[PDB]
């Protein structure tokens, strides 16, 4: 009993997890549910942004279990490692399922590429709480903004737009995205589901205190 507690307790990495999701929209694909997750292809600026997001990643078996279910089967599954935050991207073009994976994540990325506006109503999702809309422009400088689920805008401000050039948009994008993911995990935990606390450290500390309580 305590032995298997040691197995499961050991599992949860001291490296905070971040399942994120990337989308793409086109002119015809604007305000579409069956045309947003259809195309396995985006724009040119979309692709260069994607390859600028993170560094190369492969889903081989020789690498350890540090990858999650998203990106287990089919394809570059771009990611970014750091001191405690692991970031799996779930590129909308790398599922060939995709609806089951992209919808499940709390926060997602949506590249506004058509030229029209955007709302959460594009995809029902699972818990796609907050969105981050990014649109190109004539020159390199391109616009960025974010949208709530009309429920947590008190937690995460929404009237935050900003201009950002090419070599700086991926970083600030992923940054605010991580902030949103933090907000979403804090919200879920605030619903008190007795689930994995976002601070994996305090999580496994609870694990150990639970072992203690189990013995005594």
């Amino acid at each position: 009993s305590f032995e298997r507690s040691v197995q499961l307790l050991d599992q949860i990495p001291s490296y905070d997890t971040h399942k994120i999701a990337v989308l793409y929209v086109g002119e015809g694909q604007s305000n579409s549910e069956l045309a947003i997750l259809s195309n396995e292809h985006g724009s040119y600026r979309y692709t260069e942004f994607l390859t600028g997001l993170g560094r190369l990643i492969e889903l081989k078996d020789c690498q350890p279990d540090k990858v999650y279910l998203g990106g287990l089967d089919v394809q570059f599954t771009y990611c970014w490692h750091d001191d405690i935050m692991q970031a799996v991207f779930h590129i909308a073009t790398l599922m060939p399922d995709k609806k089951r994976h992209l919808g499940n994540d709390f926060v997602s990325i949506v590249y506004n590429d058509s030229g029209e506006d955007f709302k959460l109503g594009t995809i029902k999702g699972q818990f796609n709480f907050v969105h981050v809309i990014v649109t190109p422009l004539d020159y390199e400088c391109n616009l960025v903004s974010l949208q709530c689920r009309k429920d947590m805008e008190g937690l995460v401000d929404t009237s935050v737009a900003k201009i950002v050039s090419d070599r700086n948009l991926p970083f600030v994008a992923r940054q605010m995205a991580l902030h949103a993911n933090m907000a979403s995990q804090v919200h879920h935990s605030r619903s008190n589901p007795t689930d994995i606390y976002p601070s994996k450290w305090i999580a496994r500390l609870r694990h150990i205190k639970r072992l203690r309580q189990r013995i005594c």
């Binding site: 490296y15 050039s165 600030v172 940054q175 804090v186 305090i202 150990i208 205190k209 203690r212």
Partner: protein, 319 residues
């Protein structure tokens, strides 16, 4: 007029001097705020400046010109809180924006910190940092020094930590520093770790940024803050509960339950990363496996730490 003329998406640079003039004199009526609201979308569509040969500088100067002075009030709080967004949008052009003028507008933001509010100002500061960090390089120290005096505002609670984090992820910017920078950073962060006052989101984010800066913090002069830190920690648990809130800082040897867990995790992380840095993943060299494969083992819980011991029986040799 302003409404129609600000909608050009195919005759230019005339409207430019028009705007220059109408902002130059202060009409002292709502029309001021009206054109100020006409600005930000014109900055979203500040795209036809491919024609205008960098005369925006003057309006930018004009901007800072009308940033301060009674010649504006000839709504002033709203004046500032709306002109800050327009220069915010303006900051995009790191190139055409004059270098000395960029220094000037950085100083304008520095003075906009001490204000009715600077949330917009501080997030714009994060943006300009990621954009023209060369300019911020000089302002950074005194910037943080003044930031020491925002006094635990739940309003600006989020954007500050956001900015500190973002900055931290930009090492080459702060590639050089000294103790006082980090000390001030931690002093600013610490109060935001209240178990009751701020947000659980704010709490966890604060602990995250504390940890990650303390990581990004130099290996030398790393132990220094450690007591202060836990001081800053124990001074956040001042009156929430005091069962065993004792110092326990290893400088000697070298619900509120959630707050206790917070203190636990933070000081543990520090102990793990004080005196050096090391990834938290062990992977034994093949020799180790060969030696102790299937070895006789035993695991104990001295405290919140999990200790495990394994002993070889020469499996590979007898193999």
């Amino acid at each position: 007029a302003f409404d129609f003329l600000l909608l050009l998406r195919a005759p230019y640079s005339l409207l430019f001097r028009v705007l220059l003039q109408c902002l130059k004199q202060e009409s002292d009526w709502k029309v001021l705020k009206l054109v100020l609201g006409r600005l930000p979308e014109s900055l979203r569509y500040k795209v036809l400046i491919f024609t205008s040969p960098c005369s925006v500088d003057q309006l930018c100067s004009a901007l800072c010109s009308m940033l301060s002075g009674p010649k504006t009030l000839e709504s002033r709080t709203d004046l500032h809180l709306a002109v800050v967004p327009v220069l915010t949008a303006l900051i995009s052009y790191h190139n055409y924006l004059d270098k000395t003028k960029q220094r000037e507008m950085v100083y304008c933001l520095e003075q906009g910190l001490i204000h009715r509010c600077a949330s917009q100002c501080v997030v714009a500061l994060s943006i300009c940092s990621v954009e023209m960090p060369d300019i911020i390089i000089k302002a950074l120290p005194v910037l943080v020094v003044k930031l020491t005096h925002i006094s635990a505002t739940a309003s600006m609670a989020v954007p500050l930590l956001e900015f500190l984090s973002t900055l931290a992820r930009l090492p080459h910017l702060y590639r050089n520093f000294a103790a006082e920078q980090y000390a001030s950073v931690f002093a600013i962060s610490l109060p935001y770790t209240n178990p009751s006052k701020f947000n659980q989101y704010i709490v966890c984010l604060a602990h995250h940024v504390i940890a990650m800066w303390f990581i990004r913090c130099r290996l030398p002069f790393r132990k220094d803050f450690v007591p202060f830190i836990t001081k800053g920690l124990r001074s956040n648990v001042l009156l929430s509960f005091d069962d065993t809130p004792e110092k326990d800082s290893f400088r000697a040897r070298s619900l509120k339950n959630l707050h206790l867990e917070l203190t636990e995790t933070c000081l543990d992380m520090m102990a793990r990363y004080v005196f050096s840095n090391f990834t938290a993943v062990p992977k034994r060299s093949p020799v180790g496996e060969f030696l102790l494969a299937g070895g006789r083992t035993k695991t104990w819980l001295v405290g919140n730490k999990l200790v495990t011991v394994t002993t070889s029986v020469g499996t590979g040799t007898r193999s």
